[PDB]
Amino acid sequence: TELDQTAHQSDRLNNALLMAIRSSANVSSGFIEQLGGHDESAGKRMALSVELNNKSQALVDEFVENAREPALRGLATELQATFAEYAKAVAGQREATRQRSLEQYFKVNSDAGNAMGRLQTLRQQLVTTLSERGQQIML
Amino acid sequence: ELDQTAHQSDRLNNALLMAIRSSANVSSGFIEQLGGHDESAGKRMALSVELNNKSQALVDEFVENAREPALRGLATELQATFAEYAKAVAGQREATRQRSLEQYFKVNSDAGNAMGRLQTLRQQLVTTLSER
Ligand code: NA
C-alpha cells in the first residue's frame, strides 16, 4: 500500500501537468476565437482554462499533502510555488483576452512559458524520485 | 513484465504532454503572427511540428508494445483518438499558415474534444498498467 501511494502521487502529478498545459491551450485558442468574433465560444474556453488550472492546483496541493519524506516534500513544495507563478501568468493571459489586448497577452505569455518550463523539469525529477522510492520498497 | 510497464507509462505520459504542448505552441504562434512577431511565430510552428512528430512516434511505440488482451483495445482507441487530435492540430497549423481566424476556430473544437478524451483514456491505461 505504500506502493499504492507512490502510484497515486505519480498520477496526481501527471494529471496536474497535463491539465495545466491544457489550460494554456484553451486561453490562447480562446483568444483566437475572440478575435475571430466567436465571443461565446471564447468565454467557454476562458471558463475551461480557469477550471483546468484550478483542478491542477488542487492536485498539486493533494500531492504536497501526501508527500512525507524530506526528499519528496521539498521538490513538492517547489512545484507548488512554481505552479502559483504559472497560474498567475495564465490568469494574466485570460484578462488580456477579455480585454482584447494583444499587448497585455504577450507581456505574460512569456512568464507562463518560463514557469511551465520549470514545472516540466520539476515533474520529471518528482517522477524519478517517486519511481525510485517504489522500487526501493520492492527491493 | 514490470520493466515494460514503466517504459509504457513513460511513453504514454510523454506522448500526451508533448501532444498538448504542440497545440499550445501553434495557438501562441498564431497570436504572435497577429501581433507582427513573424519570426517568433515561425519558431512556435517548428516546435509544434517537432512535438507532434515525437508524440506520434511514442504513441505508435506504445501501441506496438501493448499486445496484452487487457490493453489491446484501449491502446487501439488511444491511437485512433490521437490520430483525430493530430489531424486537428495539423488543421490549426494550416489555418495559421493561411492566417485564417475562421479556419482556426473550426478546428479548435476538434482538438480540444479529442484531448479531453485522451486525458480520460490516459487514466484508464495507467490504471490497467498499474494492475501489473
Ligand atoms: Na476565430
Decide if B30 touches A, using CB distance below 8 A.
yes
- Give phi and psi for B131, each to the nearest 5: -75, 15
- Can you tell me the distance from the alpha carbon of B91 to that of A12, in angstroms, rounded to the nearest whole number? 31
Q: d(Cα A29, Cα A106) in Å, to the nearest integer?
A: 14
**Cα separation values, B111 from A73, A111, B23, B88, Å:** 36, 25, 8, 5
Side chain identity, residue B100: S
Buried b / exposed e along A96-134 (16+ C-beta atoms within 10 A): bbeeeebebbbebbebbeebbebbeebbeebbebbbebb
Q: How far apart are CA A111 and CA A40, in angstroms?
A: 27
Q: How far is CA A72 from CA A46, A112, A132, B76, in A?
A: 33, 25, 11, 35
Cα separation, A111 vs B25, whole angstroms: 15
3-state secondary structure of A75: helix
Within 10 angstroms of residue B91's Cβ, the number of other Cβ atoms is 18
Q: A104 in contact with B at a CB cutoff of 8 Å?
A: no
- Which of B30, B52, B105, B118 should be substituted to probe chain A, the one whose Cβ sees the most A Cβ atoms within 10 Å? B105
The grid coordinates listed for B45 are 510552428
Any A CB within 8 A of B112 CB: yes
Please name the residue that has the C-alpha cell 498498467. Answer: B129
Resolution (A): 2.0
Taking a C-beta distance cutoff of 8 angstroms, is the pair B78, B60 a contact? no
Which among A9, A37, A23 has a CA at the least distance from the CA of A93? A23
Gyration radius of chain B's alpha carbons = 16
Task: Tell me if chain B has a CB within 8 Å of the CB of A120.
Answer: yes
- Domains of chain B, with CATH numbers? 2-130 (1.20.120.30)
B28 annotated to a ligand binding site: yes
Q: What is the largest CA-CA distance in chain B?
A: 53
Shortest Cα distance, chain B CAs vs residue A79, angstroms: 17
Minimal C-alpha gap between B13 and chain A (Å): 7
* C-alpha–C-alpha distance, residues B22 and A24, integer Å: 11
Residue A43 CA, chain-centre distance (Å), reads: 20
User: In A1-139, which ranges are E strands?
Assistant: none
Minimum distance, in Å, between the CA of residue A19 and any CA atom of chain B:
9
Interface test with A, best of B10, B11, B13, B103 (most A CBs within 10 A): B13
Which parts of B28-90 are beta strand (E)? none
CA angle B101, B104, B106 (to 5 degrees): 115
Answer yes or no: do B20 and A21 touch at CB < 8 A: yes
Q: Any known ligand binding at A86? A: yes
**Which chain B residue shows the shortest CA-CA distance from A52?**
B116
Method of determination is X-ray
Whether residue B95 contacts residue B111, with contact meaning beta carbons closer than 8 Å, is answered with: no
Nearest CA in chain B to A13: B13
Tell me if residue A69 falls in helix, strand or coil: coil
Backbone angles phi, psi at A35, to 5 degrees: -70, -30
| Helices and strands (H, E) in chain A, number of each type | 4, 0
CA-based nearest residue to A94, from A47, A27, A19, A45: A27
Between the alpha carbon of residue B121 and those of residues A58, B9, B17, B78, the distances in Å are: 21, 13, 14, 7
The sign of the dihedral angle between the CA atoms of B38, B41, B47, B52 is negative
